[PDB]
Structure 1
């Protein structure tokens, strides 16, 4: 995947968390990044079009990560959009629920740039990108 201009949507209800992920993406060479504060805000941005990757926190108010993921997967236009779920604590049940709903990957924060880069690269490879 050589498109460093792949457009990311970073979804988290904590501004600091969104800024962390944006800064790690910047470090890796991904500068085309937008932010959303919950699942509905995210869906509104996604319908504007152009997005290539979603990094979403699991626990958000109003519409959480799992529901956002399900909505994306049920959307004809965005059904195959890569979605990487972020959580503070890995739980078997959550990982399985996310997988059943079509998550592309799942990562525990806090994470480093190297860790994020590995998650991304493994998803690109899994998806044939």
Structure 2
């Protein structure tokens, strides 16, 4: 799916952002940005509309919904694929998420082969 899809990692973690940076590179990707919270993503995504956005779920302060749900509030591009990253997974949470653009949800930590398993499972609907 393109060897340079744009990704946005807003994980406040002070080390996880580094792991994914490489991991993605292993999948053939050289174009990622970074933030520290939703207010940051909203101000940093006005850049050019990333094709992919990775965000934790509650590490910065509130949650990522408002950060994502807002993206959907737009239109013509509410399909922005998002692979939110979280520990474990409660259906109640993965639901309100997909109901928006959180369409992608990968637990963590994942192995480049594991992430590759989820990503490929999503692009099957995007058909690139």
What's the TM-score, normalizing by structure 1? 0.89
- Measure the CA separation in 2 of the matches of 1:48 and 1:62: 23
By percentage of residues, which structure has more helix?
1
What's the TM-score, normalizing by structure 2? 0.90
- Contact 1:56-1:65 within 8 A present in 2 as well: yes
- Count of residues in correspondence between the two structures: 128
Which moves more between the two structures, 112-121 or 71-80? 71-80
- Contact 1:39-1:60 within 8 A present in 2 as well: no
Q: For residue 128 of structure 1, report the CA deviation from its aligned partner.
A: 2.2
- Measure the CA separation in 1 of the matches of 2:49 and 2:41: 13
- Contact 1:90-1:108 within 8 A present in 2 as well: yes
Give the SS at the match of 2:4: coil
Going from structure 1 to structure 2, the CA distance change for 1:77 and 1:35 (only over 3 Å counts) comes to farther
Give the SS at the match of 2:55: strand
- Contact 1:40-1:62 within 8 A present in 2 as well: no
- Measure the CA separation in 2 of the matches of 1:45 and 1:26: 21
| Uncovered stretches (5+) of structure 2, i.e. residues with no partner | none
Which residue of 2 is the match for residue 102 of structure 1? 101
- Measure the CA separation in 2 of the matches of 1:34 and 1:92: 29
